[PDB]
Amino acid sequence: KQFHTGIEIKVWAIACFAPQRQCTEVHLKSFTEQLRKISRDAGMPIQGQPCFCKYAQGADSVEPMFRHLKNTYAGLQLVVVILPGKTPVYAEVKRVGDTVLGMATQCVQMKNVQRTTPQTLSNLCLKINVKLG
Protein backbone atom coordinates (compact mmCIF):
# COMPACT_ATOMS: atom_id res chain seq x y z
CA LYS A 1 0.00 0.00 0.00
CA GLN A 2 0.98 3.66 -0.37
CA PHE A 3 3.06 5.54 2.21
CA HIS A 4 1.10 8.09 4.27
CA THR A 5 2.65 11.42 5.21
CA GLY A 6 1.91 13.60 8.22
CA ILE A 7 2.30 10.89 10.84
CA GLU A 8 4.25 11.87 13.96
CA ILE A 9 4.50 9.33 16.81
CA LYS A 10 5.05 11.41 19.96
CA VAL A 11 3.39 9.26 22.64
CA TRP A 12 4.21 5.56 22.49
CA ALA A 13 5.08 2.71 24.80
CA ILE A 14 7.15 -0.45 24.76
CA ALA A 15 5.91 -3.66 26.37
CA CYS A 16 8.64 -6.29 26.29
CA PHE A 17 7.34 -9.82 26.80
CA ALA A 18 10.80 -11.22 26.00
CA PRO A 19 12.91 -12.05 29.08
CA GLN A 20 15.19 -9.19 30.13
CA ARG A 21 18.23 -11.48 30.24
CA GLN A 22 17.66 -12.18 26.53
CA CYS A 23 16.52 -8.77 25.31
CA THR A 24 18.23 -6.33 27.67
CA GLU A 25 17.76 -2.63 28.30
CA VAL A 26 20.58 -1.76 25.88
CA HIS A 27 18.99 -3.92 23.17
CA LEU A 28 15.75 -2.03 23.75
CA LYS A 29 17.55 1.35 23.70
CA SER A 30 19.57 0.60 20.59
CA PHE A 31 16.59 -0.83 18.69
CA THR A 32 14.63 2.25 19.62
CA GLU A 33 17.40 4.58 18.37
CA GLN A 34 17.61 2.76 15.01
CA LEU A 35 13.83 2.95 14.68
CA ARG A 36 13.88 6.68 15.52
CA LYS A 37 16.37 7.38 12.76
CA ILE A 38 14.76 5.39 9.93
CA SER A 39 11.22 6.54 10.81
CA ARG A 40 12.57 10.12 10.88
CA ASP A 41 14.25 9.67 7.50
CA ALA A 42 11.08 8.19 5.99
CA GLY A 43 8.97 11.12 7.18
CA MET A 44 7.01 9.31 9.89
CA PRO A 45 9.13 10.31 12.91
CA ILE A 46 8.78 8.12 15.99
CA GLN A 47 10.19 10.10 18.88
CA GLY A 48 13.19 8.54 20.58
CA GLN A 49 11.78 8.52 24.11
CA PRO A 50 8.82 6.20 24.82
CA CYS A 51 6.44 7.27 27.60
CA PHE A 52 6.70 3.81 29.14
CA CYS A 53 9.02 0.84 28.74
CA LYS A 54 8.55 -2.28 30.85
CA TYR A 55 9.07 -6.02 30.84
CA ALA A 56 6.11 -8.33 31.38
CA GLN A 57 5.62 -12.08 31.33
CA GLY A 58 2.82 -14.16 29.92
CA ALA A 59 -0.39 -13.57 28.00
CA ASP A 60 -2.35 -12.85 31.21
CA SER A 61 -0.20 -9.76 31.83
CA VAL A 62 -1.27 -8.12 28.56
CA GLU A 63 -4.75 -6.91 29.56
CA PRO A 64 -3.73 -5.43 32.94
CA MET A 65 -0.78 -3.61 31.28
CA PHE A 66 -2.80 -2.21 28.37
CA ARG A 67 -5.54 -1.03 30.72
CA HIS A 68 -2.89 0.69 32.81
CA LEU A 69 -1.39 2.36 29.71
CA LYS A 70 -4.80 3.58 28.55
CA ASN A 71 -5.50 4.83 32.06
CA THR A 72 -2.15 6.59 32.46
CA TYR A 73 -0.92 8.14 29.20
CA ALA A 74 -3.24 10.58 27.44
CA GLY A 75 -2.83 10.66 23.65
CA LEU A 76 -1.02 7.33 23.61
CA GLN A 77 -0.68 6.55 19.90
CA LEU A 78 1.06 3.17 19.80
CA VAL A 79 2.25 0.24 21.90
CA VAL A 80 5.22 -1.67 20.48
CA VAL A 81 5.15 -5.21 21.81
CA ILE A 82 8.29 -7.33 21.80
CA LEU A 83 7.61 -11.08 21.41
CA PRO A 84 9.85 -14.00 22.43
CA GLY A 85 9.19 -16.13 19.36
CA LYS A 86 5.86 -17.92 18.90
CA THR A 87 3.56 -17.57 21.92
CA PRO A 88 -0.06 -16.94 22.97
CA VAL A 89 1.07 -13.42 23.82
CA TYR A 90 0.48 -12.38 20.20
CA ALA A 91 -3.16 -13.51 20.04
CA GLU A 92 -3.86 -11.80 23.35
CA VAL A 93 -2.19 -8.54 22.35
CA LYS A 94 -4.50 -8.45 19.34
CA ARG A 95 -7.63 -9.37 21.35
CA VAL A 96 -7.04 -6.62 23.90
CA GLY A 97 -5.70 -3.95 21.53
CA ASP A 98 -8.05 -4.43 18.58
CA THR A 99 -11.21 -5.64 20.33
CA VAL A 100 -11.29 -4.68 24.00
CA LEU A 101 -9.54 -1.32 24.35
CA GLY A 102 -9.24 -0.01 20.78
CA MET A 103 -5.51 0.56 21.16
CA ALA A 104 -3.07 0.55 18.22
CA THR A 105 -0.36 -2.07 18.70
CA GLN A 106 2.58 -3.28 16.66
CA CYS A 107 4.42 -6.48 17.50
CA VAL A 108 8.05 -7.23 16.68
CA GLN A 109 10.16 -10.34 17.25
CA MET A 110 12.83 -10.36 19.94
CA LYS A 111 15.45 -11.45 17.39
CA ASN A 112 14.80 -8.24 15.40
CA VAL A 113 15.28 -6.15 18.53
CA GLN A 114 18.48 -7.91 19.62
CA ARG A 115 19.93 -7.41 16.14
CA THR A 116 18.28 -4.94 13.79
CA THR A 117 18.68 -4.57 10.03
CA PRO A 118 17.53 -1.74 7.77
CA GLN A 119 15.18 -4.19 6.08
CA THR A 120 13.47 -5.40 9.29
CA LEU A 121 13.22 -1.84 10.63
CA SER A 122 11.66 -0.86 7.31
CA ASN A 123 9.13 -3.71 7.53
CA LEU A 124 8.20 -2.31 10.94
CA CYS A 125 7.81 1.29 9.80
CA LEU A 126 5.56 0.22 6.95
CA LYS A 127 3.28 -1.83 9.24
CA ILE A 128 3.14 1.12 11.63
CA ASN A 129 2.42 3.44 8.73
CA VAL A 130 -0.54 1.37 7.55
CA LYS A 131 -1.96 1.15 11.06
CA LEU A 132 -1.76 4.87 11.81
CA GLY A 133 -2.16 6.25 8.29
Tab-separated table of N, CA and C in Angstrom:
chain	number	residue	atom	x	y	z
A	1	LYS	N	0.833	-1.200	0.000
A	1	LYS	CA	0.000	0.000	0.000
A	1	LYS	C	0.870	1.253	0.000
A	2	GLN	N	0.249	2.398	-0.270
A	2	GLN	CA	0.980	3.659	-0.369
A	2	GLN	C	1.370	4.226	0.996
A	3	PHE	N	2.531	4.878	1.021
A	3	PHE	CA	3.062	5.538	2.210
A	3	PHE	C	2.243	6.792	2.543
A	4	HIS	N	1.847	6.918	3.805
A	4	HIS	CA	1.098	8.089	4.271
A	4	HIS	C	2.012	9.090	4.962
A	5	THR	N	1.869	10.360	4.595
A	5	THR	CA	2.650	11.422	5.208
A	5	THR	C	1.887	12.030	6.384
A	6	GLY	N	2.568	12.871	7.157
A	6	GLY	CA	1.905	13.605	8.222
A	6	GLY	C	1.822	12.883	9.552
A	7	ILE	N	2.309	11.645	9.601
A	7	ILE	CA	2.299	10.888	10.842
A	7	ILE	C	3.502	11.279	11.692
A	8	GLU	N	3.228	11.632	12.949
A	8	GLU	CA	4.255	11.870	13.957
A	8	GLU	C	3.901	11.095	15.225
A	9	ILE	N	4.736	10.123	15.593
A	9	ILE	CA	4.500	9.333	16.811
A	9	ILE	C	5.218	9.925	18.026
A	10	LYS	N	4.507	10.768	18.771
A	10	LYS	CA	5.053	11.413	19.960
A	10	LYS	C	4.832	10.616	21.263
A	11	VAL	N	3.662	10.013	21.424
A	11	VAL	CA	3.394	9.256	22.641
A	11	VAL	C	3.269	7.771	22.328
A	12	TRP	N	4.241	6.983	22.765
A	12	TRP	CA	4.211	5.562	22.485
A	12	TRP	C	4.921	4.790	23.594
A	13	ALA	N	4.589	3.512	23.706
A	13	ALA	CA	5.078	2.707	24.804
A	13	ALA	C	5.722	1.429	24.286
A	14	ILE	N	6.639	0.873	25.056
A	14	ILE	CA	7.145	-0.447	24.765
A	14	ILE	C	6.725	-1.400	25.866
A	15	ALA	N	6.204	-2.556	25.468
A	15	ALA	CA	5.909	-3.655	26.368
A	15	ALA	C	6.723	-4.843	25.912
A	16	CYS	N	7.756	-5.197	26.673
A	16	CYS	CA	8.638	-6.293	26.291
A	16	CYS	C	8.276	-7.591	26.993
A	17	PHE	N	7.723	-8.533	26.236
A	17	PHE	CA	7.341	-9.823	26.797
A	17	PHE	C	8.476	-10.846	26.678
A	18	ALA	N	9.584	-10.430	26.053
A	18	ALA	CA	10.804	-11.216	25.997
A	18	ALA	C	11.531	-11.066	27.333
A	19	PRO	N	12.215	-12.129	27.788
A	19	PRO	CA	12.910	-12.045	29.082
A	19	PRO	C	14.018	-10.990	29.018
A	20	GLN	N	14.196	-10.250	30.103
A	20	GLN	CA	15.193	-9.195	30.132
A	20	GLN	C	16.587	-9.737	29.856
A	21	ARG	N	16.907	-10.896	30.425
A	21	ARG	CA	18.234	-11.480	30.240
A	21	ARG	C	18.498	-11.842	28.773
A	22	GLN	N	17.448	-11.929	27.964
A	22	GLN	CA	17.659	-12.184	26.526
A	22	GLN	C	17.615	-10.900	25.688
A	23	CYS	N	16.667	-10.033	26.004
A	23	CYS	CA	16.516	-8.765	25.312
A	23	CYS	C	16.679	-7.669	26.361
A	24	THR	N	17.919	-7.217	26.555
A	24	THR	CA	18.235	-6.331	27.673
A	24	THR	C	17.837	-4.887	27.411
A	25	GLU	N	18.035	-4.053	28.422
A	25	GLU	CA	17.757	-2.631	28.304
A	25	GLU	C	18.518	-2.003	27.138
A	26	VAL	N	19.772	-2.395	26.927
A	26	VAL	CA	20.576	-1.761	25.880
A	26	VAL	C	20.099	-2.208	24.496
A	27	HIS	N	19.576	-3.431	24.418
A	27	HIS	CA	18.993	-3.920	23.172
A	27	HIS	C	17.785	-3.063	22.873
A	28	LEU	N	16.928	-2.886	23.881
A	28	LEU	CA	15.755	-2.033	23.747
A	28	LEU	C	16.147	-0.607	23.316
A	29	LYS	N	17.150	-0.033	23.979
A	29	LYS	CA	17.554	1.352	23.696
A	29	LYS	C	18.115	1.511	22.299
A	30	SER	N	18.906	0.530	21.873
A	30	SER	CA	19.572	0.601	20.585
A	30	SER	C	18.551	0.397	19.462
A	31	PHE	N	17.674	-0.589	19.641
A	31	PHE	CA	16.590	-0.827	18.689
A	31	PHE	C	15.762	0.440	18.518
A	32	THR	N	15.456	1.069	19.646
A	32	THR	CA	14.626	2.251	19.623
A	32	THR	C	15.330	3.357	18.848
A	33	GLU	N	16.630	3.542	19.088
A	33	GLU	CA	17.403	4.575	18.369
A	33	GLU	C	17.436	4.339	16.859
A	34	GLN	N	17.617	3.086	16.446
A	34	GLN	CA	17.613	2.759	15.012
A	34	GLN	C	16.237	3.003	14.392
A	35	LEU	N	15.188	2.698	15.148
A	35	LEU	CA	13.830	2.949	14.680
A	35	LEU	C	13.550	4.449	14.575
A	36	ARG	N	14.038	5.222	15.541
A	36	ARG	CA	13.878	6.678	15.524
A	36	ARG	C	14.465	7.257	14.238
A	37	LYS	N	15.668	6.806	13.896
A	37	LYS	CA	16.374	7.376	12.764
A	37	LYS	C	15.720	7.033	11.424
A	38	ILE	N	15.379	5.762	11.200
A	38	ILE	CA	14.760	5.387	9.931
A	38	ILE	C	13.345	5.974	9.790
A	39	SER	N	12.564	5.966	10.874
A	39	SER	CA	11.225	6.541	10.809
A	39	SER	C	11.326	8.040	10.514
A	40	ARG	N	12.293	8.711	11.143
A	40	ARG	CA	12.569	10.122	10.878
A	40	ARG	C	12.890	10.318	9.398
A	41	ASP	N	13.811	9.515	8.880
A	41	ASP	CA	14.255	9.672	7.496
A	41	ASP	C	13.120	9.456	6.500
A	42	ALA	N	12.234	8.519	6.826
A	42	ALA	CA	11.083	8.187	5.991
A	42	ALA	C	9.949	9.218	6.069
A	43	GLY	N	10.016	10.122	7.033
A	43	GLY	CA	8.970	11.120	7.177
A	43	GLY	C	7.794	10.675	8.034
A	44	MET	N	8.014	9.682	8.885
A	44	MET	CA	7.013	9.314	9.886
A	44	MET	C	7.710	9.206	11.248
A	45	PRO	N	8.213	10.331	11.764
A	45	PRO	CA	9.131	10.311	12.909
A	45	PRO	C	8.503	9.732	14.178
A	46	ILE	N	9.114	8.663	14.682
A	46	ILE	CA	8.781	8.116	15.987
A	46	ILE	C	9.766	8.714	16.969
A	47	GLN	N	9.272	9.453	17.952
A	47	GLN	CA	10.185	10.099	18.878
A	47	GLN	C	10.986	9.071	19.674
A	48	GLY	N	12.218	9.445	20.014
A	48	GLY	CA	13.193	8.536	20.583
A	48	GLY	C	12.872	8.059	21.981
A	49	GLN	N	12.093	8.844	22.720
A	49	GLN	CA	11.782	8.516	24.106
A	49	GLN	C	10.335	8.022	24.267
A	50	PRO	N	10.169	6.720	24.542
A	50	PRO	CA	8.824	6.197	24.825
A	50	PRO	C	8.327	6.660	26.198
A	51	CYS	N	7.014	6.811	26.345
A	51	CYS	CA	6.436	7.270	27.598
A	51	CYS	C	6.516	6.197	28.670
A	52	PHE	N	6.796	4.965	28.260
A	52	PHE	CA	6.696	3.808	29.141
A	52	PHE	C	7.533	2.723	28.486
A	53	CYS	N	8.298	1.987	29.278
A	53	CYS	CA	9.020	0.838	28.743
A	53	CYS	C	9.221	-0.155	29.852
A	54	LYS	N	8.478	-1.260	29.805
A	54	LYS	CA	8.554	-2.275	30.852
A	54	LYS	C	8.544	-3.711	30.326
A	55	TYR	N	9.159	-4.597	31.094
A	55	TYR	CA	9.072	-6.022	30.845
A	55	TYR	C	7.804	-6.593	31.479
A	56	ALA	N	7.231	-7.593	30.820
A	56	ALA	CA	6.107	-8.329	31.377
A	56	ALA	C	6.246	-9.773	30.946
A	57	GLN	N	5.542	-10.664	31.637
A	57	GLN	CA	5.624	-12.084	31.333
A	57	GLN	C	4.254	-12.702	31.196
A	58	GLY	N	3.992	-13.321	30.054
A	58	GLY	CA	2.816	-14.159	29.915
A	58	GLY	C	1.609	-13.431	29.384
A	59	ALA	N	0.780	-14.162	28.646
A	59	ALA	CA	-0.387	-13.572	28.003
A	59	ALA	C	-1.330	-12.886	29.002
A	60	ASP	N	-1.449	-13.428	30.215
A	60	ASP	CA	-2.346	-12.849	31.214
A	60	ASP	C	-1.919	-11.453	31.678
A	61	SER	N	-0.675	-11.068	31.405
A	61	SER	CA	-0.203	-9.759	31.834
A	61	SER	C	-0.590	-8.669	30.840
A	62	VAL	N	-0.923	-9.070	29.619
A	62	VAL	CA	-1.269	-8.119	28.561
A	62	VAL	C	-2.426	-7.188	28.927
A	63	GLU	N	-3.581	-7.751	29.277
A	63	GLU	CA	-4.746	-6.910	29.556
A	63	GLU	C	-4.519	-5.933	30.732
A	64	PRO	N	-3.989	-6.413	31.869
A	64	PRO	CA	-3.730	-5.433	32.939
A	64	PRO	C	-2.772	-4.308	32.504
A	65	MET	N	-1.743	-4.628	31.715
A	65	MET	CA	-0.779	-3.612	31.277
A	65	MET	C	-1.410	-2.596	30.316
A	66	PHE	N	-2.180	-3.087	29.352
A	66	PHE	CA	-2.796	-2.206	28.371
A	66	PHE	C	-3.848	-1.310	29.038
A	67	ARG	N	-4.606	-1.856	29.981
A	67	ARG	CA	-5.536	-1.029	30.723
A	67	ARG	C	-4.789	0.087	31.436
A	68	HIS	N	-3.729	-0.289	32.139
A	68	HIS	CA	-2.890	0.688	32.813
A	68	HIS	C	-2.354	1.769	31.866
A	69	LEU	N	-1.896	1.378	30.673
A	69	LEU	CA	-1.392	2.357	29.715
A	69	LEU	C	-2.502	3.318	29.302
A	70	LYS	N	-3.658	2.761	28.942
A	70	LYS	CA	-4.803	3.577	28.548
A	70	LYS	C	-5.175	4.528	29.677
A	71	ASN	N	-5.120	4.026	30.904
A	71	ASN	CA	-5.503	4.828	32.063
A	71	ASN	C	-4.457	5.863	32.493
A	72	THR	N	-3.246	5.773	31.944
A	72	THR	CA	-2.146	6.586	32.457
A	72	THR	C	-1.605	7.630	31.479
A	73	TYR	N	-1.544	7.278	30.193
A	73	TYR	CA	-0.923	8.138	29.196
A	73	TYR	C	-1.937	8.699	28.217
A	74	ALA	N	-2.303	9.965	28.380
A	74	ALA	CA	-3.237	10.584	27.445
A	74	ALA	C	-2.579	10.710	26.072
A	75	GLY	N	-3.340	10.473	25.009
A	75	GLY	CA	-2.833	10.655	23.652
A	75	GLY	C	-1.860	9.575	23.202
A	76	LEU	N	-1.791	8.504	23.984
A	76	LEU	CA	-1.024	7.327	23.612
A	76	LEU	C	-1.401	6.917	22.198
A	77	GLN	N	-0.414	6.844	21.311
A	77	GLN	CA	-0.679	6.546	19.897
A	77	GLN	C	-0.377	5.113	19.498
A	78	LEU	N	0.542	4.477	20.217
A	78	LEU	CA	1.064	3.174	19.803
A	78	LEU	C	1.720	2.428	20.958
A	79	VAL	N	1.488	1.120	21.014
A	79	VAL	CA	2.249	0.243	21.897
A	79	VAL	C	3.027	-0.737	21.023
A	80	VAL	N	4.345	-0.739	21.183
A	80	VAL	CA	5.215	-1.673	20.479
A	80	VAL	C	5.457	-2.826	21.424
A	81	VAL	N	5.140	-4.026	20.958
A	81	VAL	CA	5.149	-5.211	21.812
A	81	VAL	C	6.230	-6.142	21.319
A	82	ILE	N	7.178	-6.465	22.188
A	82	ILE	CA	8.290	-7.327	21.799
A	82	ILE	C	7.930	-8.770	22.157
A	83	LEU	N	7.989	-9.678	21.180
A	83	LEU	CA	7.606	-11.077	21.413
A	83	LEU	C	8.797	-12.033	21.431
A	84	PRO	N	8.816	-12.959	22.404
A	84	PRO	CA	9.846	-14.001	22.432
A	84	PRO	C	9.441	-15.198	21.573
A	85	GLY	N	9.569	-15.063	20.258
A	85	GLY	CA	9.187	-16.134	19.359
A	85	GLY	C	7.682	-16.330	19.295
A	86	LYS	N	7.267	-17.573	19.055
A	86	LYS	CA	5.857	-17.921	18.897
A	86	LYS	C	5.230	-18.198	20.254
A	87	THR	N	4.251	-17.386	20.638
A	87	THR	CA	3.558	-17.568	21.917
A	87	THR	C	2.132	-17.038	21.849
A	88	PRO	N	1.305	-17.433	22.817
A	88	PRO	CA	-0.064	-16.936	22.969
A	88	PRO	C	-0.085	-15.439	23.242
A	89	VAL	N	1.069	-14.850	23.538
A	89	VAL	CA	1.068	-13.417	23.817
A	89	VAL	C	0.556	-12.649	22.598
A	90	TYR	N	0.895	-13.116	21.399
A	90	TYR	CA	0.483	-12.382	20.201
A	90	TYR	C	-1.037	-12.321	20.047
A	91	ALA	N	-1.695	-13.471	20.124
A	91	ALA	CA	-3.157	-13.509	20.038
A	91	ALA	C	-3.823	-12.610	21.069
A	92	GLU	N	-3.286	-12.603	22.287
A	92	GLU	CA	-3.863	-11.795	23.352
A	92	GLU	C	-3.651	-10.305	23.115
A	93	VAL	N	-2.462	-9.936	22.653
A	93	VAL	CA	-2.194	-8.537	22.346
A	93	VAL	C	-3.245	-8.041	21.361
A	94	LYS	N	-3.517	-8.841	20.341
A	94	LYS	CA	-4.503	-8.448	19.342
A	94	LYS	C	-5.943	-8.414	19.900
A	95	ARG	N	-6.305	-9.391	20.732
A	95	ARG	CA	-7.635	-9.368	21.353
A	95	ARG	C	-7.852	-8.096	22.171
A	96	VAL	N	-6.871	-7.752	22.995
A	96	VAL	CA	-7.045	-6.618	23.895
A	96	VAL	C	-6.929	-5.276	23.157
A	97	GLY	N	-5.938	-5.173	22.280
A	97	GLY	CA	-5.697	-3.947	21.533
A	97	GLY	C	-6.799	-3.648	20.533
A	98	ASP	N	-7.083	-4.610	19.664
A	98	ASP	CA	-8.051	-4.432	18.585
A	98	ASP	C	-9.508	-4.508	19.025
A	99	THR	N	-9.812	-5.386	19.976
A	99	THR	CA	-11.205	-5.636	20.335
A	99	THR	C	-11.668	-5.037	21.661
A	100	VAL	N	-10.851	-5.153	22.696
A	100	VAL	CA	-11.291	-4.677	24.000
A	100	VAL	C	-11.082	-3.185	24.243
A	101	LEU	N	-9.890	-2.676	23.945
A	101	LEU	CA	-9.539	-1.319	24.347
A	101	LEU	C	-9.414	-0.336	23.178
A	102	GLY	N	-9.386	-0.855	21.955
A	102	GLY	CA	-9.235	-0.013	20.777
A	102	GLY	C	-7.927	0.758	20.833
A	103	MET	N	-6.853	0.014	21.042
A	103	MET	CA	-5.506	0.558	21.158
A	103	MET	C	-4.618	0.039	20.026
A	104	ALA	N	-3.992	0.952	19.282
A	104	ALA	CA	-3.070	0.548	18.224
A	104	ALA	C	-1.845	-0.165	18.806
A	105	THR	N	-1.518	-1.324	18.248
A	105	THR	CA	-0.355	-2.075	18.699
A	105	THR	C	0.423	-2.555	17.505
A	106	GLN	N	1.727	-2.704	17.686
A	106	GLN	CA	2.577	-3.277	16.660
A	106	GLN	C	3.549	-4.210	17.336
A	107	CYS	N	3.528	-5.483	16.939
A	107	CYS	CA	4.418	-6.485	17.505
A	107	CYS	C	5.692	-6.581	16.690
A	108	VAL	N	6.766	-7.004	17.344
A	108	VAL	CA	8.048	-7.231	16.682
A	108	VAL	C	8.732	-8.387	17.407
A	109	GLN	N	9.480	-9.198	16.665
A	109	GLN	CA	10.156	-10.344	17.254
A	109	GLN	C	11.429	-9.945	17.972
A	110	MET	N	11.647	-10.577	19.121
A	110	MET	CA	12.832	-10.364	19.937
A	110	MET	C	14.131	-10.408	19.134
A	111	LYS	N	14.221	-11.329	18.178
A	111	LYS	CA	15.451	-11.453	17.385
A	111	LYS	C	15.735	-10.183	16.580
A	112	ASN	N	14.677	-9.476	16.180
A	112	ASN	CA	14.804	-8.236	15.403
A	112	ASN	C	15.031	-6.995	16.258
A	113	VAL	N	14.926	-7.176	17.570
A	113	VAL	CA	15.280	-6.146	18.532
A	113	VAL	C	16.726	-6.340	18.990
A	114	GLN	N	17.114	-7.598	19.205
A	114	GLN	CA	18.476	-7.913	19.615
A	114	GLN	C	19.458	-7.497	18.532
A	115	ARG	N	19.099	-7.783	17.286
A	115	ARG	CA	19.925	-7.409	16.144
A	115	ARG	C	19.024	-6.849	15.057
A	116	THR	N	19.122	-5.554	14.805
A	116	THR	CA	18.285	-4.942	13.786
A	116	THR	C	18.963	-4.999	12.419
A	117	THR	N	18.170	-4.831	11.366
A	117	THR	CA	18.685	-4.572	10.027
A	117	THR	C	17.814	-3.482	9.395
A	118	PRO	N	18.366	-2.741	8.430
A	118	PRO	CA	17.529	-1.743	7.768
A	118	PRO	C	16.257	-2.369	7.234
A	119	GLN	N	16.361	-3.554	6.640
A	119	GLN	CA	15.175	-4.190	6.079
A	119	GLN	C	14.098	-4.534	7.120
A	120	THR	N	14.481	-5.030	8.295
A	120	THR	CA	13.471	-5.401	9.291
A	120	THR	C	12.870	-4.157	9.941
A	121	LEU	N	13.692	-3.119	10.087
A	121	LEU	CA	13.225	-1.843	10.627
A	121	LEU	C	12.242	-1.194	9.660
A	122	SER	N	12.551	-1.306	8.369
A	122	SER	CA	11.664	-0.859	7.313
A	122	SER	C	10.334	-1.607	7.332
A	123	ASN	N	10.375	-2.933	7.471
A	123	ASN	CA	9.133	-3.706	7.535
A	123	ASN	C	8.256	-3.135	8.639
A	124	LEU	N	8.896	-2.807	9.759
A	124	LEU	CA	8.202	-2.310	10.945
A	124	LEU	C	7.592	-0.935	10.707
A	125	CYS	N	8.355	-0.033	10.094
A	125	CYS	CA	7.812	1.295	9.804
A	125	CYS	C	6.597	1.220	8.900
A	126	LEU	N	6.654	0.339	7.904
A	126	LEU	CA	5.559	0.222	6.952
A	126	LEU	C	4.281	-0.321	7.619
A	127	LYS	N	4.420	-1.348	8.450
A	127	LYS	CA	3.283	-1.834	9.236
A	127	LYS	C	2.729	-0.720	10.119
A	128	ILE	N	3.609	0.010	10.795
A	128	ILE	CA	3.144	1.117	11.635
A	128	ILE	C	2.426	2.166	10.810
A	129	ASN	N	2.938	2.402	9.600
A	129	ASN	CA	2.416	3.439	8.727
A	129	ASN	C	1.013	3.110	8.252
A	130	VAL	N	0.779	1.843	7.942
A	130	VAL	CA	-0.541	1.369	7.548
A	130	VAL	C	-1.520	1.530	8.705
A	131	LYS	N	-1.099	1.071	9.880
A	131	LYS	CA	-1.957	1.146	11.063
A	131	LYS	C	-2.395	2.572	11.378
A	132	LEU	N	-1.454	3.507	11.368
A	132	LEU	CA	-1.761	4.866	11.806
A	132	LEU	C	-2.093	5.842	10.680
A	133	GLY	N	-2.051	5.370	9.436
A	133	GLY	CA	-2.162	6.247	8.287
A	133	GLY	C	-3.585	6.636	7.954
